[PDB]
Design a protein around this motif. Structure first.
Motif, PDB file in Angstrom:
ATOM      1  N   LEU A  30       0.836  -1.197   0.000  1.00 35.45           N
ATOM      2  CA  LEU A  30       0.000   0.000   0.000  1.00 35.45           C
ATOM      3  C   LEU A  30       0.872   1.248   0.000  1.00 35.45           C
ATOM      4  N   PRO A  31       0.691   2.182  -0.938  1.00 41.69           N
ATOM      5  CA  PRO A  31       1.429   3.450  -0.864  1.00 41.69           C
ATOM      6  C   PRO A  31       0.884   4.357   0.232  1.00 41.69           C
ATOM      7  N   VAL A  32       1.782   5.137   0.832  1.00 36.08           N
ATOM      8  CA  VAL A  32       1.472   5.972   1.993  1.00 36.08           C
ATOM      9  C   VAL A  32       1.563   7.457   1.647  1.00 36.08           C
ATOM     10  N   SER A  33       2.740   7.922   1.233  1.00 43.43           N
ATOM     11  CA  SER A  33       2.997   9.339   1.028  1.00 43.43           C
ATOM     12  C   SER A  33       3.427   9.589  -0.412  1.00 43.43           C
ATOM     13  N   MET A  34       3.383  10.858  -0.805  1.00 37.09           N
ATOM     14  CA  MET A  34       3.750  11.306  -2.141  1.00 37.09           C
ATOM     15  C   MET A  34       5.037  12.122  -2.075  1.00 37.09           C
ATOM     16  N   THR A  35       5.449  12.634  -3.231  1.00 33.36           N
ATOM     17  CA  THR A  35       6.610  13.507  -3.321  1.00 33.36           C
ATOM     18  C   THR A  35       6.157  14.949  -3.127  1.00 33.36           C
ATOM     19  N   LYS A  36       6.652  15.585  -2.069  1.00 37.58           N
ATOM     20  CA  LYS A  36       6.241  16.939  -1.723  1.00 37.58           C
ATOM     21  C   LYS A  36       7.036  17.938  -2.553  1.00 37.58           C
ATOM     22  N   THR A  37       6.333  18.790  -3.299  1.00 39.64           N
ATOM     23  CA  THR A  37       6.955  19.777  -4.172  1.00 39.64           C
ATOM     24  C   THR A  37       6.509  21.180  -3.782  1.00 39.64           C
ATOM     25  N   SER A  38       7.289  22.174  -4.198  1.00 38.02           N
ATOM     26  CA  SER A  38       6.977  23.582  -3.986  1.00 38.02           C
ATOM     27  C   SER A  38       7.250  24.342  -5.275  1.00 38.02           C
ATOM     28  N   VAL A  39       6.242  25.061  -5.763  1.00 42.64           N
ATOM     29  CA  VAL A  39       6.304  25.754  -7.045  1.00 42.64           C
ATOM     30  C   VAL A  39       6.164  27.250  -6.803  1.00 42.64           C
ATOM     31  N   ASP A  40       7.177  28.010  -7.209  1.00 38.95           N
ATOM     32  CA  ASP A  40       7.120  29.466  -7.178  1.00 38.95           C
ATOM     33  C   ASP A  40       6.230  29.929  -8.327  1.00 38.95           C
ATOM     34  N   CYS A  41       5.310  30.845  -8.029  1.00 39.62           N
ATOM     35  CA  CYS A  41       4.443  31.395  -9.062  1.00 39.62           C
ATOM     36  C   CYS A  41       5.154  32.463  -9.885  1.00 39.62           C
ATOM     37  N   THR A  42       6.159  33.130  -9.307  1.00 38.51           N
ATOM     38  CA  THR A  42       6.846  34.226  -9.985  1.00 38.51           C
ATOM     39  C   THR A  42       7.827  33.725 -11.043  1.00 38.51           C
ATOM     40  N   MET A  43       8.694  32.767 -10.685  1.00 32.52           N
ATOM     41  CA  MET A  43       9.790  32.372 -11.571  1.00 32.52           C
ATOM     42  C   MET A  43       9.332  31.470 -12.710  1.00 32.52           C
ATOM     43  N   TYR A  44       8.172  30.827 -12.575  1.00 33.33           N
ATOM     44  CA  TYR A  44       7.635  30.059 -13.692  1.00 33.33           C
ATOM     45  C   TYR A  44       7.006  30.973 -14.738  1.00 33.33           C
ATOM     46  N   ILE A  45       6.216  31.954 -14.296  1.00 31.41           N
ATOM     47  CA  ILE A  45       5.541  32.855 -15.224  1.00 31.41           C
ATOM     48  C   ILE A  45       6.507  33.905 -15.765  1.00 31.41           C
ATOM     49  N   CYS A  46       7.272  34.547 -14.889  1.00 31.68           N
ATOM     50  CA  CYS A  46       8.159  35.631 -15.280  1.00 31.68           C
ATOM     51  C   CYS A  46       9.596  35.139 -15.393  1.00 31.68           C
ATOM     52  N   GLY A  47      10.326  35.741 -16.328  1.00 32.09           N
ATOM     53  CA  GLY A  47      11.720  35.437 -16.596  1.00 32.09           C
ATOM     54  C   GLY A  47      12.710  36.316 -15.855  1.00 32.09           C
ATOM     55  N   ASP A  48      12.285  36.830 -14.682  1.00 37.32           N
ATOM     56  CA  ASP A  48      12.939  37.880 -13.877  1.00 37.32           C
ATOM     57  C   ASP A  48      13.161  39.153 -14.694  1.00 37.32           C
ATOM     58  N   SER A  49      12.087  39.647 -15.302  1.00 38.19           N
ATOM     59  CA  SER A  49      12.086  40.900 -16.040  1.00 38.19           C
ATOM     60  C   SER A  49      11.226  41.918 -15.303  1.00 38.19           C
ATOM     61  N   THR A  50      11.537  43.202 -15.500  1.00 41.99           N
ATOM     62  CA  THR A  50      10.814  44.258 -14.796  1.00 41.99           C
ATOM     63  C   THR A  50       9.443  44.520 -15.409  1.00 41.99           C
ATOM     64  N   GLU A  51       9.234  44.126 -16.668  1.00 40.17           N
ATOM     65  CA  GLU A  51       7.934  44.313 -17.302  1.00 40.17           C
ATOM     66  C   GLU A  51       6.919  43.284 -16.812  1.00 40.17           C
ATOM     67  N   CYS A  52       7.367  42.050 -16.553  1.00 42.74           N
ATOM     68  CA  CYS A  52       6.454  40.981 -16.151  1.00 42.74           C
ATOM     69  C   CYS A  52       6.028  41.128 -14.693  1.00 42.74           C
ATOM     70  N   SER A  53       6.885  41.725 -13.860  1.00 47.64           N
ATOM     71  CA  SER A  53       6.524  41.943 -12.464  1.00 47.64           C
ATOM     72  C   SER A  53       5.598  43.142 -12.301  1.00 47.64           C
ATOM     73  N   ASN A  54       5.696  44.131 -13.193  1.00 50.83           N
ATOM     74  CA  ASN A  54       4.816  45.291 -13.111  1.00 50.83           C
ATOM     75  C   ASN A  54       3.428  44.984 -13.660  1.00 50.83           C
ATOM     76  N   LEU A  55       3.331  44.054 -14.614  1.00 54.00           N
ATOM     77  CA  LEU A  55       2.021  43.599 -15.062  1.00 54.00           C
ATOM     78  C   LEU A  55       1.377  42.644 -14.066  1.00 54.00           C
ATOM     79  N   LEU A  56       2.180  41.981 -13.227  1.00 52.51           N
ATOM     80  CA  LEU A  56       1.655  41.118 -12.172  1.00 52.51           C
ATOM     81  C   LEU A  56       1.005  41.929 -11.055  1.00 52.51           C
ATOM     82  N   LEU A  57       1.519  43.133 -10.785  1.00 52.08           N
ATOM     83  CA  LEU A  57       0.911  44.008  -9.787  1.00 52.08           C
ATOM     84  C   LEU A  57      -0.345  44.696 -10.309  1.00 52.08           C
ATOM     85  N   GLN A  58      -0.536  44.740 -11.633  1.00 51.65           N
ATOM     86  CA  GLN A  58      -1.793  45.242 -12.180  1.00 51.65           C
ATOM     87  C   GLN A  58      -2.855  44.151 -12.239  1.00 51.65           C
TER      88      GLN A  58
END
Lengths: 49, 38
Positions: free
Chosen positions: A1-29
């Motif tokens: 019987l399986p018990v537990s899974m693989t616990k992951t953590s996903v950043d919402c910023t670095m997947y959507i944005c490429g660390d650019s200043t335009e993508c972070s300013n549109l995220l605040l809008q």
């Protein structure tokens, strides 16, 4: 019987944005649309323990 | 010249604290980060 899974953590910023200043300013809008990628993967990882 | 590109600005910041009626001391957890560079 399986018990537990693989616990992951996903950043919402670095997947959507490429660390650019335009993508972070549109995220605040957007307000916050990724409010629930962090707390659901936290809420899985408490229940996996 | 042939140069690789390795991207910057990664790793998480996690906080460990008790309640506000107990103590203000905060332990800071680096997530997957070697602290010898920083």
């Amino acid at each position: 019987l399986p018990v537990s899974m693989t616990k992951t953590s996903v950043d919402c910023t670095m997947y959507i944005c490429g660390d650019s200043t335009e993508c972070s300013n549109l995220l605040l809008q957007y307000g916050s649309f990724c409010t629930q990628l962090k707390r659901a993967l936290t809420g899985i990882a408490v229940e996996q323990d | 010249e042939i140069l690789d590109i390795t991207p910057c600005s990664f790793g998480g910041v996690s906080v460990i604290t008790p309640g506000t009626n107990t103590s203000n001391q905060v332990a800071v957890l680096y997530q997957g980060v070697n602290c010898t560079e920083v």
